[PDB]
Ligand SMILES: CCCCCc1cc(O)cc(O)c1C(=O)O
């Protein structure tokens with residue numbers, strides 16, 4: 001199952017801060033059992049004002065809750081939630 | 097590079113139609129050289145009213161244009177564009 005985050009940063013957040021934000025988020029994989037993998041990226045096309053995408057892999061929808069209530073994720077939010085202006089969350093199983 | 101589509105269908109579109117829509121879109125990989133891979137899925141969490149996600153792989157941002165102007169993609173849009181109510185498009189390179 002993929003946990004997909006689409007976000008916009010507040011205008012005051014700097015590039016260095018954004019880098020630190022994603023570095024810290026990626027490193028949660030090592031701390032949170034339920035998180036299997038993380039990739040992120042910045043939209044280059046600007047067709048739509050979301051700018052960044054994060055893809056997180058889980059074994060199942062069930063274990064997403066394990067991540068949600070994990071002190072490390074709660075802690076990540078407690079430190080960084082002032083960074084984002086808007087976000088969208090999706091959970092789905094990629095298929096053909 | 098990943099070409100990410102987030103969409104909502106119009107209310108009148110049926111499940112069978114949605115299945116046919118994605119089946120046809122997935123099969124474009126065989127027709128359009130620039131398209132390397134496609135996955136799609138339906139959001140189960142409904143936390144946000146986008147419902148579906150499509151992930152398309154390209155070799156580079158440059159070749160996304162090759163896809164955009166390809167008669168098969170233009171043709172796909174010509175047949176199915178009345179199906180969607182809203183969509184968002186992002187192009188990014190997944191990284192850590
Ligand atoms: C890079 C964004 C990480 C935090 C994203 C987030 C924010 C929030 O306010 C509530 C959530 O359930 C989640 C999530 O499911 O991951």
Ligand SMILES: CCCCCc1cc(O)cc(O)c1C(=O)O
Nearest residue numbers: 101121150164172173177183185
């Ligand atoms: C499953 C949605 C396929 C069509 C998505 C689309 C719609 C549109 O109106 C303009 C576009 O440039 C694209 C695209 O880049 O793929």
